[PDB]
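From the thread on structure requests for the teaching lab: each student submitted one protein with a one-line request. Submission from student K.M.:

"Model Carbonic anhydrase 2 from Homo sapiens, tokens only."
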Amino acid sequence: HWGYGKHNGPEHWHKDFPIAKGERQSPVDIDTHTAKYDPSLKPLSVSYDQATSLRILNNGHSFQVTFDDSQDKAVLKGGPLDGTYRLLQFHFHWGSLDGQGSEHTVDKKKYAAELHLVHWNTKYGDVGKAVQQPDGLAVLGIFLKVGSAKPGLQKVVDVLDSIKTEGKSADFTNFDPRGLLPESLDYWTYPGSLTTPPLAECVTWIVLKEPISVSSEQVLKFRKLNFNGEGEPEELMVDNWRPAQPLKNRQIKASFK
Ligand SMILES: NS(=O)(=O)c1nnc(NC(=O)[C@]23C[C@H]4C[C@H](C[C@H](C4)C2)C3)s1
Ligand SMILES: [Zn+2]
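Reply posted by the TA:
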């Protein structure tokens, strides 16, 4: 089964998921001098006031926080998007050292980690149907750099000890994801894919220009998680990022000059 190691990592995924070599794969390097400002792009609308978080879970490739998506409660609209996209979950990708960990890069620069808030287009009724559509999902990507602590991340960090190994979950209600956002909603956008299997080409990517800062103590707690299940040889969950893929016939648009 797939992972991030030498024998099951990103260079192997195409054998089970041939779309790994497809025409709109993610992540990509964002070349800031080639991205074009698009004045027709509307402001992003992030409406998280009624978000209802449910659980936090170690799924063997990251940890994720899941939300109630049975109603319009936490939604993303505007920007490049048509219609309403409901927040399903967020998760992170991170590195073994501070100089790597992000999936998207900016002028080849790698950040220490990357937060992905995963949303799906309500016109398709459920997320499984949405993943089969070219406009089915919208992922809001936020870079993390190491510096001052991010207070809105601390409640997450606090609970990671309880989900150390694959399969573990914990109650994670009343979490406000607005605490994970930077000040600015300036963004780049391009059509892409899921960055883990099945690698489906169903995502409108919205990558925020402004990173959030997290403390060294916060990211160190990410690095104490395990890929393995309890009772198996301990393999630290680090470097769970897919590298940049070919841009091919795609243009990255910027919301800002
Ligand atoms: N790293 S990223 O944000 O591009 C993501 N890469 N893969 C992701 N997968 C999902 O989000 C799913 C949401 C539900 C349906 C598909 C089957 C399970 C269930 C998970 C997809 S997000
Ligand atoms: Zn992701």
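TA comment: Residues 91, 93, 116, 195 surround zinc ion (ligand 2) (CB under 6 Å). The helical segments are 127-130, 154-159, 216-222.
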